[PDB]
Amino acid sequence: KSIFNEPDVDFHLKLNQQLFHIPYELLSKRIKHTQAVINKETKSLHEHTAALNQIFEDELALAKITEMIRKVDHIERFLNTQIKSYCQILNRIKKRLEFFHELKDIKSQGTRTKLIQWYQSYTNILIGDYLTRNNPIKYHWNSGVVFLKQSQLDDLIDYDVLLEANRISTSLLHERNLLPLISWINENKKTLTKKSSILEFQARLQEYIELNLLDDQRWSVLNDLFLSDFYSMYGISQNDPLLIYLSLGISSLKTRDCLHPDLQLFTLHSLKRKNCPVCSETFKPITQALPFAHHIQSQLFENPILLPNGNVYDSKKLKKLAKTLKKQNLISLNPGQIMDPVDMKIFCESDSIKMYPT
């Protein structure tokens, strides 16, 4: 029961599931840290109170209790920080949940424009996440970060995991290839080597060194390896979704003739071909190297007409355009004249031939 052809809401979630993983790993790191901190401080407090119990069996007890308080309040502040980060991550997921609940409400109910607005939001959310990925950092902020902040939808895109990847992968290829990548391995050696992936090895060899083994392209292969491990760690789906959508859309409406080889302006904008997105003015180089289309139904205008120019237009649209040109004082017509847009010409009404396209 879709409106026109949009798929069921169960499909959009599976379409972009990276939006529900990169917050989740951030969420799980928090618990995996705040459990280790408690397991490291609880034994400390226990062994510490063992001393007091021994000492009772001598006003040093007040000193010991004061040290106990001075130790406990630090745990209190630590938990406070952890909770104020945990709640923020939860909010981040909940916003993206209600985003799709909005589409479900719209789809369960004219309303076509109330859905076009939603697809406008769904396109901005996506241009933002492509721009904040590959656009050089200024200092850190990018053009993507600015767009996300100033479109009032910063919650629905991380823009910090992606930005962190951009920082590392531009330092590994610029700035004399000064490497902070070691500062990323050292904080993540517990889970990276469980997968047993060869990243510390190549980083160590490159650090030692600084002719393929001395060539520059080792920088590029190192960068590619780091991106592979990062993306497979988080779930970022290493192809820009904007690129995927374009690579299908442009080949989905590239029909059989898109690259077909003051009064003039109005005439040549009165056509319905000077609107085609795929062959407009700046997508021709994109669309040159892409397949065309498949169609098993000849869709055509209803009542066609041929005139000596060689091309067939319509029966009524020509009449309405002739009247329009009559009511704006651009041309000088007469009772039976008719005008042809392409290669502007005037033909009599009886130089018109009906056609039957089977």
Next chain:
Amino acid sequence: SELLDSFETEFAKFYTDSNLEETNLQKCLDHTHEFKSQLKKLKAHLNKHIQESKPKRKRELIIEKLSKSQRQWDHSVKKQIKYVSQQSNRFNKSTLNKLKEFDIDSVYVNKLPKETMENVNEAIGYHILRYSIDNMPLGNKNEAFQYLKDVYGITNKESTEFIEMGQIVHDLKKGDTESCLKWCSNEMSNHTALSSLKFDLYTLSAVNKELKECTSLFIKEYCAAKHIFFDSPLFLIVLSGLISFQFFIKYKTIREWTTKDELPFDVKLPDFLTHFHPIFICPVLKEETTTENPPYSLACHHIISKKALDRLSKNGTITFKCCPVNTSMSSTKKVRFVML
């Protein structure tokens, strides 16, 4: 449908009854707070006892109280953190069963060439310049072109018109007409719609359901007057891309790059993205007439493709079928369908 509801129900378990703002670690924070308070009370009592001891069933209770406090604190903290860890590890067994059955990136075939990434960066420029121009702090009339060029990036001469559009639209949004009136009265084109716009905004000069119906009309009549576009050439393309996924995955699952030509599985998409170029299917050979093999009309007022015509007649012999009263290539003509 079912997945979204079964997702919200599982997700709500992270929160307590309030549905918001009371996360599970509040238990740990409360327990540590209570533990500290108990130690402070015990410290005060011991201080008082020693102070008054200056010249026993008392100490044998305070020491046990300290022991009890530490047992309760560590036991409760461990139990609560264990429960929250298990809950977070069980929510994965509902974010995994569904959202890891697609692998979006497996659909990327016919990769977009690496040389043409400037053109994408101009389509993005145009879309940002058109749909979301007013939602930015710009400032002066022309001291914002530099800001555009400096932060985001500048498109071709189709930026001055959009700066003016954003300026007038924002001015009209603040309930201050008498600039849109001037703009309308200066461009005197099609008188009809312009006069209709003049009357509508004049009515606005005399609400929350009227602004949304006048800004749109002005936008339409400005885009149709300065000859640019009304919908971005990128939004429509992303729409068609979103529509073709279902058919592509259906073809993929039937199957178990493609003849360097027309991709298969004949995706169908709504009318307002199809009424651009006319597509015609030959009635005798069943093939879409291309730039080569263009359709011919054969004096019977029928249309057949040229190749089928040149196999109906070897070199054009008078064989005349299709009203059996056709004729050979002395009375046949070229056609081109224009969707006027």
